[PDB]
RNA sequence: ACUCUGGUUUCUCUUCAGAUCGCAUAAAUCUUUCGCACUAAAGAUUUCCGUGGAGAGGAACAACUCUGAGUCCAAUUUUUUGAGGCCUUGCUUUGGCAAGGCUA
């Protein structure tokens, strides 16, 4: 039984680049290496970049704080 | 305990329909009616907003996207 | 419909609405041992669902057990159906069809009638007495009928107010009971999927006297209600099974801390129950209000003035509330008619699931072909008309609808045992009142009216002008065998017809009753015991025929057998002087007849598997294992017919032409028997030779059937014949001191005591014995009177054992009225029965031969 | 304090307009703290509420039976009349 | 109170999930949480154009969870 | 959590009472039954021993225990918002309505 919070903690401890999809907005998602998470789903992503699938553009913002209400799904990425 | 959650739990074992917020209406046997509005049915016929209908061997809709539910009124009287 | 009905918590429209949905219906049979609380449990449920019905402070009201004889005796006699709407733990109301069966072993047949139309079994076990004889018998019968099984451990208060056991010892007693039930189930069922344990919710702990009904889930929900933050399912998972609780870490661990802490069950469940009961019974006036406040129960001044037993009942009703644990147990584990239809069709329907109509019934769809199946016949108060009670397996029965009713002899090839009848009315059968309804969908119990005429025991209701391939359901296989035989006549022969009518009626009221007329014009009733026949005769005298009836003393039905092969190869020709059949008779191997009776072998199997079984289990020759023709008189009859005719001497094709006639003659001869017209048991018949006339008109029909019976009789007689008494198994629940006295009683009635083990956790002993049925008359009364009523016994048919004497001994002199000594008891049992049947004074070994 | 505002419309036929724009007219036989309503004999109409309609009074009317209106999509409610005897 | 979703029968079984914004995924449920956060092992998100992209095991929140459909026998 | 009835004890009268009116048990009369009726059964009536229910009246001291009635929750799953803006088609009650594709 692998829970989602334990998988999110393992992905934060591994430092791998994960991509989070926006809730109610699938045209643009975020990607980066999350250093830690909070109890309200807020995570601290290092080297965060907003990738829009409609235009094929990437805008980097640096150290960002992602709220748990805006992110709907989170997956793993190689880059 | 609410009257609607008690009516949803008492509606298990019979045929009922549930329409979500996106217009998807799944009709079938209410296998599991949780207190959080989670409706799990087995062999439910799901009709979307476009009009196409399909059959699922086991469907489970969460309570966050629940719009309305129509069950039999014979148990209320 | 619209009619006057008692005030109930739910509404009749809701009850009718639940019937349409077959996923919310539970067909449940509450079975168990005598006086284990089933009827009181049903009464508690009725009180819960009927606000106006209240149990008397002194007399335990019984909503079921409505008969006058049941009320006077205090022993359940007939199964009572009750249809209610019960709320679950989550609050979801389920439709429950509960068949309250009698606990007495003599009426075990009644339970069988309640097991054919049910999907689940709830076995009630006394927490003090534990597992008894009827509980074991009902477990075997239920798991052999392919039914889901759950357990209600009733009368837990006896562990607190009678035995005064410590809570850990009470837990040990309950665990031992559960383990013993699990062992019995595993012994009677090859599959180990249906392990019973209160962790799985299969087991509920109850006290119907004080309305203390709870399972682990329900009582964990009580904890959840008093403390919201706890989830009841995981807590119920942690409550049972030697899992200790650490309050320093608030965690449940298999390792016991402090070496003195009690289990989770004892700490959280048993100890609070003990505290409640002790506070009510011991510290009422001084310390009851504080504990009542701690539990949130508030009682009025008039309610606190009650006696201790009513106060316990009230307090435990307020605490535990509704019997939601029972509903959970019967919802999660007992299949609905939708789910459980397939096993029922595969087990009971004669055509099998593979048939088209079997597939139709597997769905239990209300809008299908009508395939109702009634197994009970309930007489009205006036006793003139009968209502056929049973479940609807497919389609929907409507009031005022033409119906084809199929009897037990109805077959596709011979449809004569079928009658077109018009249904009069339909009732949903609650115990003391009936809810008239217009229709009943599939998966529900119904009292069909107007179909009682063409049926005696079992019916197959279907719709006419359809279901041309419909077959009947298998007739009720009964747990025990009806043995005790009584002759019945009227005081005034002028009113003979009335009694005859009464006989018919009792034949309908009692599923296992057998009423016939012998060759001497003597009306014969077969029952399972003296209490069973007492109830039968009370019904025959008061309910059905109001005439005075003389009853002969009770005698048992003996069996006939052989102990060694026939001296010479017996033979018989047809009256045509052709078709010579030469046979011999030999006894069967040990346990072979038991294998045949217990369905271990079936003639319906193919030749390959039957031959393989007879070759490996009993080491028969391949030719001998493949030449077997039929099993005894009936299907799976204790006797065996084989032909040893080598193909060189007899044409197998020609013999197969007369095979049906020879098998019919064999079955008839084994059913009748030549000693005293009694069933021939455990005899192997070998056809040594068979001449057959080539022309069809000189064989078959009335030529070869009587010839086969004659040659069977000769082969049986030349082989050394013997009689089998029926031996009953007796379980006596007696105090420790009385055990010795019990032996004394069984000393006077040829009783052999097999075991005298004590009851763990109880101050009593269970003396098991094997008493002859013919000597069992008054044994129960003798034992109870000799021991001042402290010892109670229940006798049930166990086996057939050879009578010590030799029936064919003309040298024995028998005085007309004297208890004969053992060495010639059989000689007494053969001639006297021969006089009761109306046959000749004695039978000669060459009576059926051809030389004389 | 009293809480009779929810019990005054209980058992009577009320017509409630949800957040999606549909109008459900049925006997309000069940309520809750989350605003979840139970409509026995409930009919859902999405075209318009028929109030003295000269051309038509029932457009896109669907009968459900025992309808369960969720309180999350509730917007407003209106009283139509008293309930029947049956 | 605070009960999790009914994911014991659907756990370890390949089923499809519907996420908000018209998202569709298919994978094996490796577990769930009390806030509707489930683990999808071997997840393959089906795009609107018809092609499916395998993203592996991911964490799906319970806020945007539309409905789950079991693709196997429960 | 604040207000208002219903109080208890005892005496007497009336009426109902198939309720084990009574967790006890008598007498009388008549009929019936076989002996040949304290030493005997059945059926019925009645009278005594004395109760319960309801009502009424009297007087004794208690007046709100009880029975009731009237009277701490912003971060998923409902009530502290993915909320608003663009285009096309049928009618325009020329306000906009119904559906779909979007941007957020």
From Swiss-Prot, chain A:
Gene3D superfamilies per the UniProt record, alphabetical: 2.30.30.100
Q: By its UniProt entry, which PANTHER family does this protein fall under?
A: SMALL NUCLEAR RIBONUCLEOPROTEIN E
Keyword list (alphabetical) reads: Cytoplasm, Disease variant, Hypotrichosis, mRNA processing, mRNA splicing, Nucleus, Ribonucleoprotein, RNA-binding, Spliceosome
Protein known as = Small nuclear ribonucleoprotein E
Domain of life of the organism encoding this protein: Eukaryota
Which tissues is this chain's protein expressed in?
Widely expressed. In scalp skin, it is present in the hair follicle, the epidermis, and the dermis.
Q: Which GO terms describe its molecular function?
A: RNA binding
Subunit (UniProt): Core component of the spliceosomal U1, U2, U4 and U5 small nuclear ribonucleoproteins (snRNPs), the building blocks of the spliceosome. Most spliceosomal snRNPs contain a common set of Sm proteins, SNRPB, SNRPD1, SNRPD2, SNRPD3, SNRPE, SNRPF and SNRPG that assemble in a heptameric protein ring on the Sm site of the small nuclear RNA to form the core snRNP. Component of the U1 snRNP. The U1 snRNP is composed of the U1 snRNA and the 7 core Sm proteins SNRPB, SNRPD1, SNRPD2, SNRPD3, SNRPE, SNRPF and SNRPG, and at least three U1 snRNP-specific proteins SNRNP70/U1-70K, SNRPA/U1-A and SNRPC/U1-C.
Q: What else is known?
A: Patients with systemic lupus erythematosus produce antibodies which interact with snRNP proteins.
Q: What positions does the domain Sm occupy?
A: 5-79
Q: What is its main location?
A: cytoplasm
* Pfam families in alphabetical order: LSM
Q: State the taxonomy lineage.
A: Eukaryota, Metazoa, Chordata, Craniata, Vertebrata
Tell me, what is an example of a GO biological process annotation in this record? spliceosomal snRNP assembly
State where the protein is found: Cytoplasm, Cytosol; Nucleus
Q: Which family does it belong to?
A: Belongs to the snRNP Sm proteins family.
Swiss-Prot record, chain C:
The record's listing under CDD domains reads:
eEF2_C_snRNP (cd04098), EF2_II_snRNP (cd04090), EF2_IV_snRNP (cd01683), snRNP_III (cd16264), Snu114p (cd04167)
Q: For this UniProt entry, what's an example GO CC term? A: U2-type catalytic step 2 spliceosome
- What is this protein's function? Required for pre-mRNA splicing as component of the spliceosome, including pre-catalytic, catalytic and post-catalytic spliceosomal complexes. Component of the U5 snRNP and the U4/U6-U5 tri-snRNP complex, a building block of the spliceosome. As a component of the minor spliceosome, involved in the splicing of U12-type introns in pre-mRNAs.
Please tell me where this protein is predominantly located. nucleus
Keyword terms of this UniProt record:
Acetylation, Disease variant, GTP-binding, Intellectual disability, Isopeptide bond, mRNA processing, mRNA splicing, Nucleotide-binding, Nucleus, Phosphoprotein, Spliceosome, Ubl conjugation
Q: How does it assemble?
A: Component of the U5 snRNP and the U4/U6-U5 tri-snRNP complex, a building block of the spliceosome. The U4/U6-U5 tri-snRNP complex is composed of the U4, U6 and U5 snRNAs and at least PRPF3, PRPF4, PRPF6, PRPF8, PRPF31, SNRNP200, TXNL4A, SNRNP40, DDX23, CD2BP2, PPIH, SNU13, EFTUD2, SART1 and USP39. Component of the pre-catalytic, catalytic and post-catalytic spliceosome complexes. Component of the minor spliceosome, which splices U12-type introns. Within this complex, interacts with CRIPT. Interacts with ERBB4 and PRPF8. Interacts with PIH1D1.
Q: Which domain of life is it from?
A: Eukaryota
Q: Where does the UniProt annotation locate this protein?
A: Nucleus
From Swiss-Prot, chain D:
Keywords of the record: Cytoplasm, Disease variant, Intellectual disability, Methylation, mRNA processing, mRNA splicing, Nucleus, Repeat, Ribonucleoprotein, RNA-binding, Spliceosome
Protein location: Cytoplasm, Cytosol; Nucleus
- GO molecular function annotations of the record: histone pre-mRNA DCP binding; RNA binding; snRNP binding; telomerase RNA binding; U1 snRNP binding; U2 snRNP binding
Describe the location of the Sm domain by residue ranges. 1-83
Q: Which GO terms describe its cellular component?
A: catalytic step 2 spliceosome; cytoplasm; cytosol; histone pre-mRNA 3'end processing complex; methylosome; nucleoplasm; nucleus; small nuclear ribonucleoprotein complex
Signal peptide feature range: none
Principal localisation: cytoplasm
Any stretches that span the bilayer, and where are they? none
What is one process in the GO biological process aspect for this record?
mRNA splicing, via spliceosome
What kind of modification does the protein receive after translation? Methylated by PRMT5.
Protein family per UniProt: Belongs to the snRNP SmB/SmN family.
Disease implication from the record: Cerebrocostomandibular syndrome: A syndrome characterized by severe micrognathia, rib defects ranging from a few dorsal rib segments to complete absence of ossification, and intellectual disability.
Miscellaneous comment as given in the Swiss-Prot or TrEMBL entry: Patients with the autoimmune disease systemic lupus erythematosus (SLE) have autoantibodies directed against some of the individual snRNP polypeptides. The most common autoantigen is called Sm. B/b' bear Sm epitopes.
What is the recorded name of this protein? Small nuclear ribonucleoprotein-associated proteins B and B'
**Origin species:** Homo sapiens (Human)
Q: What is the lineage of its organism?
A: Eukaryota, Metazoa, Chordata, Craniata, Vertebrata
Q: Which gene encodes it?
A: SNRPB
Curated annotation (Swiss-Prot), chain E:
Domain Sm residue range list: 2-74
* Molecular function as annotated in GO: RNA binding
- Which SMART domains does the UniProt record give? Sm
Q: Where in the cell is it found?
A: Cytoplasm, Cytosol; Nucleus
Its cellular-component GO annotations read: catalytic step 2 spliceosome; cytosol; methylosome; nucleoplasm; nucleus; P granule; precatalytic spliceosome; small nuclear ribonucleoprotein complex
Gene Ontology BP terms: 7-methylguanosine cap hypermethylation; mRNA splicing, via spliceosome; RNA splicing; spliceosomal complex assembly; spliceosomal snRNP assembly; U2-type prespliceosome assembly
The organism sits in which domain of life? Eukaryota
For this UniProt record, give its keywords in alphabetical order, as a comma-separated list. Answer: Cytoplasm, mRNA processing, mRNA splicing, Nucleus, Ribonucleoprotein, RNA-binding, Spliceosome
Q: What does this protein do?
A: Plays a role in pre-mRNA splicing as a core component of the spliceosomal U1, U2, U4 and U5 small nuclear ribonucleoproteins (snRNPs), the building blocks of the spliceosome. Component of both the pre-catalytic spliceosome B complex and activated spliceosome C complexes. As a component of the minor spliceosome, involved in the splicing of U12-type introns in pre-mRNAs. As part of the U7 snRNP it is involved in histone 3'-end processing.
This chain belongs to which protein, by name? Small nuclear ribonucleoprotein G
The taxonomy runs: Eukaryota, Metazoa, Chordata, Craniata, Vertebrata
Its gene name is SNRPG
